[PDB]
Design a protein around this ligand. Structure first.
Ligand SMILES: Nc1ncnc2c1ncn2[C@@H]1O[C@H](COP(=O)(O)OP(=O)(O)O)[C@@H](O)[C@H]1O
Ligand SMILES: Nc1ncnc2c1ncn2[C@@H]1O[C@H](COP(=O)(O)OP(=O)(O)O)[C@@H](O)[C@H]1O
Ligand SMILES: Nc1ncnc2c1ncn2[C@@H]1O[C@H](COP(=O)(O)OP(=O)(O)O)[C@@H](O)[C@H]1O
Ligand code: BEF
Ligand code: BEF
Ligand code: BEF
Ligand SMILES: [Mg+2]
Ligand SMILES: [Mg+2]
Ligand SMILES: [Mg+2]
Ligand SMILES: [Zn+2]
Ligand SMILES: [Zn+2]
Lengths: 214, 415, 668
């Protein structure tokens, strides 16, 4: 027997058994008008407030519907959330909870997971030129909990655009032309460059992220 | 069952020996080399031609004429090989790969070997998307003996019939049926505008860019005067513009219509995708050069995305690719000049992301005067909000989402 | 009947038809075939062609007859011999060898020459056919095309050392001291168990003595394919040529050749698995004929191969290393040199398609001729190579000029900046697949020896890569000292370089030096630095647009030029002859003019150095060679100085500032 086991920040999805009792409870609870508020409150009971952030996280967990058309165009059905704020604002706590509650979530830090670490890259294995799936490919149909987004290298954040929008990773390297599928929802937390958000300065100065990434 | 095309993962051990159709991309194709079916030896002592069948990767020659007389009489005839008298066959060890649609969630594509034999050779080229139909035959295990546990078998697919999903441009014959489908298009009237609006119908209001992309697909005329001057004869389009104006989706649409074209993007990955270095092919032991993305996109469209965020080293090669249609390499181990006739389509953002009208266009496009000269058309595609066009786009997109089809009722998007 | 089994070749019919073709071949037949009736000259077409050629071959004593395939095609009765030779080269070629022997014997006997017939009897006469059809490429050769004579052409990347080939082996029974002689039959020399005679019979009686055996010479040449037509997405291939007998060492590395030979496939042995052959055969091409000289390119420099010419004479390879010059062609050369506008005509016949770049076209031609290769017999030498730099605004046709030069020159390598590396040029170490042992190859600079190395996009090239340029740039040699290799390599290569001024467009504000942006050491070495400038001139732009549009009028256009230009074949003849016969020398008046110009020049913008004097000397020498003179005169030195002044636009440059006035920088 082989049992794939779910562990935090691993490719194995965490499915659960739904009894008829559980489905009945879900159906009954969905009838309430305040169902969105009730669910959103339950995401982070420990964290005080941030109710709009919790609602956004819940919507991310639900996700959207990706659309595929006849001509071949693919329309993104995943929503990405970025949190920028002062230190000790419980952003890392929310990221950790998202990692701890999603069916398939992958946790990365700022620069520990480089551009090679994210997406994917050829390993050039001698047994030849195998492809190794990085974080985002392994997080297909899942969430990527990037922490300290601001510390990320510019080069690292260059490679993230295609995964964010087209949801594909194109290798086109060393004679290997491949388009891996990376349909991942990205959530990131990053402090402003000046340590604390500056009301006197415009948000463009504080964020310092490229306009395309925002 | 042979009708249904199967992904590589679905070719289990059950299907061995049957006639199956595998659908996927072709990555590596070997050169055509003579494969021995039956090797013919000549024994001049008894004047007999003896033929030894060969049915493996290897074999062994003979020493004693096994024909009746030399084995029977005291005469022991020496036998010599004859290449012209022996039987050969054109052979090619291709390698098909799984598509992105067929790969399940979280896995990576896996490959299956194809042994193209006979007159079917040279019917498969790298980058092709085909449904090869063949016989899933087993072969004796070829790996390390320690890992062997029982009669392990390596498997391949002996190709029988090849169907191309996207027909090559160089393979067009005006057969009566193609003639009728074509004249029916002519009689539709306004073929230029209909074809322009046809590409990527889900995108609204960007029609001049669609016309430019259609011109890019059609291509000009290469001129080679008697002296030796060669003009490019192909268009190099750029799509500089603000974020969120559907440049990447236009590029992907063009990739869909175009028969050959690589969607090279970003940085770092492109660094080795244009190097074209040298490596040894497993099948023939030939030190074949490997082509990069641009060579694989020969006579195609290079669809370079995120042009501005890509390393200057590759832009240096893009210079020569755009102008001379060839790549000159003089690095260690390689002293050749690759032939890469390509039309480059580039999508990029201006300097400082969103266009700043205050800065001059040249200061904001950021392209050097040499590189910008090679672009036949350089669109601006600036995003300028307006209460009318914004709601037009919003209605178009909402219709596209609510029905998976372009909003225009009367329009007919050509297949 | 009586045909060879497996072939349509019949010895009697083939011999008879080949004899009839040899006796009764008229070049007027070929001219009729090649639609040359308008160009027919029965003053030499009516005479027996191969009969006269064989008479010359007998007189000289050469042992090789270079047979043309289309010659066999033209004569109607021997048309089938063309297909027979193409399909069955081995037997047919042996038959032709026998027929040549018989016909030569008949020719000698009929004319009743007094010398003994047996003295010339013992000599193997080999026929070396060529021009057998079009290239067809090489990747398209199906296995049904094994052992068929084919035409290949491409660069020669590398050549193996001569490898001895045993044909006759010498055994010896040690006890009985009886020498043994066994020939080769399909690559095997049978081992006799007993002795040849009846002295003794033992199981292991004799032992092989390799040194006593007879060995023939075999060299493996690696050629890189350059087909006219290449399928989409195909990288250049590489085929291993195998040569024999006099063809050994005939071809040097970097030579664009046109080789004809027999396609061959051979079983290959598994690694360390004794006597097990892989089913997939390895294909290689034999060699019968090599055509180094081509009329589309200049001839190979005589100076570089002068030492090897004596060794070739010793070998009697009979390869046409250098094209011969016909007498009437020499007269035409003389009359063309007698023309008043020889200089303009030759300049504009270089890159005819380019428009209104006469100063640049000139410099290119003077580079193509080159200065006198003086040989200081006491020690040291001076080479007459001239290097040109083209730093100019974009879209000024510089890359096209480099392409034309690369096509014209005999041994040239095209390179573009970042596609190059320091180890990439010069020489490096690599491992062959076949030998599986380390070998040495040649970079672009070494392969460009005796030619022009068109270096494109100079400025984009790294400062590190450009460092190695100095050595070959000044003293025309490269001396490497790296892991395993310590030697000096003579790279007599004239560098042609194109660059874009920094900013991609010339800045009128900054001086010439700052726009060019090259270090003074590297900048000074360049003999001529051309500041090609694209200025918006309505008349010039109109003329250029009209010319370019007229280029588009018809599908295969003849060039649209007002003035007549020389044929490229005749231009190659002129340039080759001028380079190899004529070695001009300097005069006292030219010496005084050179000194005066050098002094006046050395009076911010780049400061002239002694390299400028050497550039003036070499340019004057080149101009002397162009006019066919054996001495240089003061007007040539003045012309060289004028060219140097015009290349950098010295008139329009500010004297002390170094800035260029745009009003006076206008050209023709
Ligand atoms: N609003 C909050 N409610 C509850 N705990 C909070 C809140 N804000 C911060 N904390 C606590 O403060 C600490 C810092 O949170 P953390 O997520 O590490 O901050 P940062 O935003 O710097 O990553 C945690 O122990 C967290 O529980
Ligand atoms: N004119 C448009 N028509 C249709 N969709 C559009 C249009 N402009 C933007 N979009 C949408 O906006 C998103 C941007 O797509 P993308 O091609 O990645 O943008 P870009 O590459 O220009 O930054 C996609 O979801 C796309 O469908
Ligand atoms: N003066 C000219 N004469 C002929 N062709 C020219 C001229 N100027 C530009 N062209 C044409 O314009 C193009 C620019 O040439 P190219 O060598 O590619 O430019 P660059 O000098 O930037 O390398 C070529 O197609 C060339 O034929
Ligand atoms: F101080 Be926090 F982790 F933004
Ligand atoms: F933000 Be887009 F990919 F130009
Ligand atoms: F724009 Be050119 F290649 F100098
Ligand atoms: Mg944190
Ligand atoms: Mg984009
Ligand atoms: Mg150029
Ligand atoms: Zn026998
Ligand atoms: Zn003996």
């Amino acid at each position: 027997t082989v049992y794939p086991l779910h562990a935090r920040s691993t490719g194995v999805a965490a499915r659960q058994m739904l009894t008829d009792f559980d489905i009945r409870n879900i159906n009954k609870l969905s009838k309430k008008k305040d169902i969105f508020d009730i669910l959103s409150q339950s995401l982070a009971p420990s964290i005080y407030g941030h109710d709009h952030i919790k609602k956004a996280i819940l919507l991310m967990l639900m996700g959207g519907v990706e659309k595929n058309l006849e001509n071949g165009s693919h329309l993104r059905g995943d929503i990405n959330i970025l949190m920028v704020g002062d230190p000790s604002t419980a952003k890392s706590q929310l990221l950790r909870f998202v990692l701890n509650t999603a069916s398939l979530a992958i946790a990365t830090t700022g620069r520990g997971s480089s551009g090679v670490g994210l997406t994917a890259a050829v390993t050039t294995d001698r047994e030849e030129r195998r492809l190794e799936a990085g974080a985002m490919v392994l997080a297909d149909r899942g969430v990527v909990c990037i922490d300290e987004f601001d510390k990320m290298t510019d080069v690292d954040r260059v490679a993230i655009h295609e995964v964010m929008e087209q949801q594909t990773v194109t290798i086109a390297k060393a004679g290997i032309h491949t388009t891996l599928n990376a349909r991942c929802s990205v959530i990131a937390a990053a402090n402003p460059v000046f340590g604390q958000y500056d009301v006197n300065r415009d948000p463009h100065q504080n964020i310092a992220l490229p306009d395309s990434l925002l | 069952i042979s009708s249904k095309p199967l992904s590589v993962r679905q070719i289990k051990g059950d299907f061995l020996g049957q006639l199956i159709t595998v659908r996927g991309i072709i990555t590596r194709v070997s050169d055509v080399k003579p494969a021995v079916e039956v090797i013919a030896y000549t024994c001049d002592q008894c004047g007999y031609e003896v033929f030894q069948e060969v049915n493996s990767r290897t074999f062994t020659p003979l020493s004693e004429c096994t024909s009746e007389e030399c084995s029977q009489n005291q005469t022991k005839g020496q036998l010599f090989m004859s290449t012209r008298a022996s039987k050969f066959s054109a052979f090619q060890e291709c390698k098909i790969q799984e598509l992105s649609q067929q790969v399940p969630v979280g896995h990576i594509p896996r490959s299956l070997n194809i042994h193209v034999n006979g007159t079917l050779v040279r019917s498969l080229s790298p980058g092709d998307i085909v449904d090869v139909t063949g016989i899933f035959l087993p072969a004796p295990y070829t790996g390390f003996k320690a890992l062997k546990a029982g009669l392990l078998t390596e498997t391949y697919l002996e190709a029988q019939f090849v169907r191309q999903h996207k027909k090559k441009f160089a393979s067009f014959s005006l057969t009566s049926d193609v003639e009728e489908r074509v004249m029916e298009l002519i009689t539709s009237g306004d073929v230029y505008n209909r074809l322009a609006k046809s590409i990527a119908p889900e995108i609204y209001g960007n029609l001049d860019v669609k016309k430019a992309l259609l011109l890019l697909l059609v291509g000009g005329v290469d001129k080679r005067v008697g002296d030796g001057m060669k003009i490019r004869g192909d268009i190099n389009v750029c799509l500089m513009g603000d974020p969120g104006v559907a440049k990447s989706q236009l590029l992907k649409a063009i990739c869909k219509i175009s028969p050959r074209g690589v969607y090279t993007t970003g940085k770092g990955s492109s660094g080795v995708g244009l190097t074209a270095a040298v490596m040894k092919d497993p099948v023939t032991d030939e030190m074949i050069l490997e082509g990069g993305a641009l060579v694989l996109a020969d006579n195609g469209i290079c669809c370079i995305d995120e042009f501005d965020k890509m390393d200057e080293s590759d832009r240096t090669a893009i210079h020569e690719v755009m102008e001379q249609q060839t790549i000159s390499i003089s690095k260690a181990g390689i002293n050749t000049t690759l032939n890469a006739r390509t039309s480059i389509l580039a999508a990029a953002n201006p300097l400082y992301g969103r266009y700043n009208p205050r800065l001059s266009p040249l200061d904001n496009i950021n392209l050097p005067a040499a590189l910008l000269s090679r672009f036949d058309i350089l669109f601006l595609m600036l995003d300028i909000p307006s209460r009318d066009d914004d709601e037009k786009l919003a209605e178009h997109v909402t219709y596209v989402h609510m029905h998976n089809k372009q909003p225009d009722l009367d329009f007919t998007p050509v297949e | 009947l009586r045909i060879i089994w497996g072939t349509n070749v019949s010895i009697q019919e083939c011999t008879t038809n080949f004899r009839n073709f040899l006796m009764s071949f008229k070049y007027k037949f070929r001219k009729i075939l090649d639609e040359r009736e308008e160009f027919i000259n029965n003053t030499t077409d009516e005479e027996l062609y191969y009969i006269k050629q064989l008479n010359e071959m007998r007189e000289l004593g050469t042992s090789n007859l270079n047979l043309d395939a289309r010659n066999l095609l033209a004569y109607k009765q021997t048309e089938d011999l063309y297909h027979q030779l193409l399909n069955y080269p081995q037997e047919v070629i042996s038959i032709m060898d026998q027929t040549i022997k018989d016909c030569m014997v008949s020719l000698i006997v009929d004319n009743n020459l007094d010398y003994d017939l047996d003295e010339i009897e013992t000599k193997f006469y080999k026929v070396r056919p060529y021009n057998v059809g079009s290239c067809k490429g090489m990747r398209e050769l199906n296995p049904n095309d094994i052992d068929k004579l084919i035409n290949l052409k491409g660069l020669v990347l590398r050549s193996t050392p001569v490898i001895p080939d045993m044909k006759v082996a010498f055994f010896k029974c040690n006890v009985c001291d009886h020498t043994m002689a066994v020939e080769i039959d399909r690559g095997v020399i049978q081992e006799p168990a007993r002795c040849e005679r009846i002295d003794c019979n033992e199981p292991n009686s004799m032992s092989l003595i390799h040194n006593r055996c007879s060995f023939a010479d075999k060299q493996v040449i690696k050629l890189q394919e350059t087909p006219d037509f290449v399928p989409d997405g195909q990288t250049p291939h590489s085929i291993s040529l195998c040569v024999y007998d006099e063809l050994v060492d005939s071809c040097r590395a970097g030579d664009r050749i046109e080789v004809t030979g027999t396609f061959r496939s051979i079983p290959i042995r598994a690694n360390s698995r004794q006597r097990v052959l892989k089913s997939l055969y390895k294909t290689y091409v034999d060699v019968v004929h090599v055509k180094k000289v081509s009329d589309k390119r200049l001839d190979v420099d005589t100076s570089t191969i002068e030492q090897e010419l004596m060794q070739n004479k010793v070998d009697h390879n009979e390869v046409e290393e250098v094209r011969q010059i016909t007498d009437q062609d020499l007269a035409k050369i003389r009359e063309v040199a007698a023309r008043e506008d020889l200089y303009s005509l030759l300049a504009r016949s270089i890159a005819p398609s380019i428009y209104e770049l006469e100063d640049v076209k000139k410099g290119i031609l003077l580079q193509l001729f080159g200065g006198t290769n003086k040989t200081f017999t006491k020690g040291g030498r001076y080479r007459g190579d001239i290097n040109i730099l083209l730093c100019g605004d974009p879209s000024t046709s510089k890359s096209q000029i480099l392409q034309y030069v690369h096509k014209i020159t005999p041994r040239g390598v095209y390179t573009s900046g970042k596609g190059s590396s320091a180890v990439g040029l010069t020489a490096y170490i690599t491992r062959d697949v076949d030998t599986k042992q380390l070998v040495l190859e040649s970079g672009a600079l070494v392969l460009s020896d005796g030619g022009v190395c068109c270096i494109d996009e100079f400025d984009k090239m790294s400062d590190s890569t450009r460092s190695v340029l100095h050595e070959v740039m000044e003293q025309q040699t490269i001396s490497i000292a790296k892991a395993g290799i310590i030697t000096t390599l003579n790279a007599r290569s004239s560098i042609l370089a194109s660059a874009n001024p920094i900013g991609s467009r010339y800045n009128p504000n900054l001086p010439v030096t700052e726009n060019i942006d090259l270090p003074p050491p590297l900048l000074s070495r360049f003999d001529l630095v051309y500041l090609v400038l694209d200025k918006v001139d309505e008349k010039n732009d109109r003329e250029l647009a009209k010319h370019l549009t007229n280029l588009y009028l018809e599908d295969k256009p003849e060039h649209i030029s007002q003035d007549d230009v020389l044929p490229v074949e005749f231009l190659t003849m002129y340039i080759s002859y001028a380079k190899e016969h004529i070695h001009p020398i300097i005069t006292e008046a030219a010496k005084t003019e050179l000194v005066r110009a050098y002094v006046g020049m050395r009076k911010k913008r780049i400061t002239a150095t002694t390299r400028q004097l050497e550039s003036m000397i070499r340019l004057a020498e080149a101009h002397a060679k162009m006019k066919l003179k054996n001495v240089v005169e003061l007007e040539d030195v003045q012309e060289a100085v004028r060219l140097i002044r015009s290349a950098i636009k010295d008139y329009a440059t500010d004297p002390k500032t170094g800035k260029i006035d745009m009003n006076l920088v206008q050209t023709g």
